[PDB]
Design a protein around this nucleic acid. Structure first.
Lengths: 261, 261
DNA sequence: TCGCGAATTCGCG
DNA sequence: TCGCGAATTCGCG
C-alpha cells in the first residue's frame, strides 16, 4: 500500500493477527500519520455510556437499565480520537463472525446429519445476533454523521461464488453460492439497507420519503466468498480505509489540533 | 374491555391462543369495528418485497439478494389494511420469544451445569437474533410514520421483579431480577432506544442533533417479569391497541373509504 | 464474584 | 425439493 501502510500490512500478514490485534495496529498507523492527534483503543463500552449519549439527543431516551454493569464487547474493539473539545469520537468498531463448517467436513470423509449420511449441514441462524451490537453502536453514534462499523464474515455459509471441494474418496462435492441450504448472507443485508457488500459505507446517507429527512446508518459488510480464511493484510487495509473516512467527516472538530499543535 | 373487545379477549383466554392465532383474532376485531375497511393476515414477507420498498425511497437501496426466494416469518404474522390508493399498509407485526428454563428446573430437583450441581444455568444470548426481523420490518416501513412491531418476552431470563421458587426439597431458591447471571433484558433495549418497556411505541419520534432530523423506529417490548406464562387476553388487548394506533397515523389515506363507502 | 460471547444441530412445512 | 426458525450449554476473564 501507500508508504508505511504497506509496511504495517506486511507485519499483519506475517503474524496473521486477529481482528482485535489488527484494530490495535490501525491505531498505531493513525498515530504515525497524524502525530498531532491522540488515539486510543478500547475493548468494551458499558451500557451506561450508551444511555448517556442517548439522553443528550432526547431526554426520554436511554432511560432503561436492568443490570447496572451491562456492556458490549465487539471482538475487534473500538478506536477513538480526541477532538478540539476534549471529547472522544469513535473512528472504528470491528467484528468478525464465523459460520458453516461444510468445507472442513467434506475436505475429510465426514458425513453429518442425524443419520450421518449428509454431505452438508442445514445452515443455522446464530449469525443474526450480529444485529444487536450494530444497533447499540448506532444508538451510541446517533448524533454522528459517520458509522464506522466493519463486519467480517467467514465460512461455508457466506459464499459469493461457486466452489468445488474434493474429498479423500475422490468425489468432488460442488457447492452453489445461491443455494438457500447454506447461504445466510441475506440474514445480514438489512444492516446496510441492501447497499453493496465489500464496500466502505462509513458516510451516512440522508434520504426522505415526502419532506421528512432520515439518516441511515449502514454497516460495512465484508465477506470471504471464496470459502477461505481472511488475510490479515487485507483486513488491515479495509479497516484503515474506514478509519480515515471517519476522520474526514470529523474534520471540522480536529482542525485546531492539526494547526495549533 | 370496551364492548366487543372484551368478548374477543375472553375467547382468546378460553383457548390460550398462540401469538399467531391472536394476530388473526385482531384482524377479525378490526373488520368488525371498521366494516368499511379491508384487512388481511399474512404469515410471511419475501425479501423481494422489502427490496422493492427500499428502492422506492432511494434508487441505491435494496440492490442485494443472494437467494432469490429468501423471506422472513415472524411467528405472529402480519396484519394489513388497504388504503384509498389500493395499496396494503402494515398495521401489525407480532413476535414471541422464550429463554431461560431455570424456574422449571428449580421447581423440580434438577441441578444443571457441566458438573450437575448448579441451581441456575448461565444465561445465553440467542435472544439477540430478535434484532434481525426488527431491522427488516423497519426497512420495509422506512417510508411510514408508524412502526407497529410488538415483541413478547417470557422466561427466567426476562425478570423485572424478584421471585422465590420452592423446590421439592423444601429449600427456597431466591432469584434477583437485577442479576446479570440471568437477566438478558438489556440485550433488547437497543431496539427501542432505551424508551420505557411494556409500552405502545408505535408513533415514530423525530429527533435531531444540530439541524439534521432523524426518524426513530422503536419496537414495543413487552415482558412477563413475574416469570409466568403470557395471558392470551392481555396479549390481544396489547396487540389491538397497537393496531388501532397504526390506523390513526394512517388516517389520511383511509378517509375516502370511511365516507365514500 | 458476574456478565458477554461462540455458533451449532435439527425440526418444520 | 429448499429456506427459516428454536434457544441452548458453557468457556472466558
Amino acid at each position: 500500500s501507500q508508504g508505511v501502510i504497506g509496511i504495517f500490512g506486511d507485519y499483519a500478514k506475517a503474524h496473521d493477527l486477529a481482528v482485535g490485534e489488527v484494530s490495535k495496529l490501525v491505531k498505531k498507523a493513525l498515530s504515525n500519520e497524524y502525530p498531532q492527534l491522540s488515539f486510543r483503543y478500547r475493548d468494551s463500552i458499558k451500557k451506561t455510556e450508551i444511555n448517556e449519549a442517548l439522553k443528550k439527543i432526547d431526554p426520554d431516551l436511554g432511560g432503561t437499565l436492568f443490570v447496572s454493569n451491562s456492556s458490549i464487547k465487539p471482538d475487534g474493539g473500538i478506536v477513538e480520537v480526541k477532538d478540539d473539545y476534549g471529547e472522544w469520537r469513535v473512528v472504528l468498531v470491528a467484528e468478525a463472525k464465523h459460520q458453516g463448517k461444510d468445507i472442513i467436513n467434506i475436505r475429510n470423509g465426514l458425513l453429518v446429519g442425524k443419520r450421518g449420511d449428509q454431505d452438508l449441514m442445514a445452515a443455522g441462524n446464530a449469525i443474526e445476533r450480529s444485529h444487536k451490537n450494530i444497533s447499540e453502536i448506532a444508538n451510541f453514534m446517533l448524533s454522528e454523521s459517520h458509522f464506522p462499523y466493519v463486519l467480517f464474515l467467514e465460512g461455508s455459509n457466506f459464499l459469493t461464488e461457486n466452489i468445488s471441494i474434493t474429498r479423500p474418496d475422490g468425489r468432488v462435492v460442488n457447492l452453489e453460492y445461491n443455494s438457500g441450504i447454506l447461504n445466510r448472507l441475506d440474514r445480514l443485508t438489512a444492516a446496510n439497507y441492501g447497499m453493496p457488500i465489500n464496500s466502505n459505507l462509513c458516510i451516512n446517507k440522508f434520504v426522505n420519503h415526502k419532506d421528512k429527512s432520515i439518516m441511515l446508518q449502514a454497516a460495512s459488510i465484508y465477506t470471504q466468498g471464496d470459502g477461505r480464511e481472511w488475510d490479515s493484510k487485507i483486513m488491515f487495509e479495509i479497516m484503515f480505509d474506514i478509519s480515515t473516512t471517519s476522520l474526514r467527516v470529523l474534520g471540522r472538530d480536529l482542525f485546531e489540533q492539526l494547526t495549533s499543535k
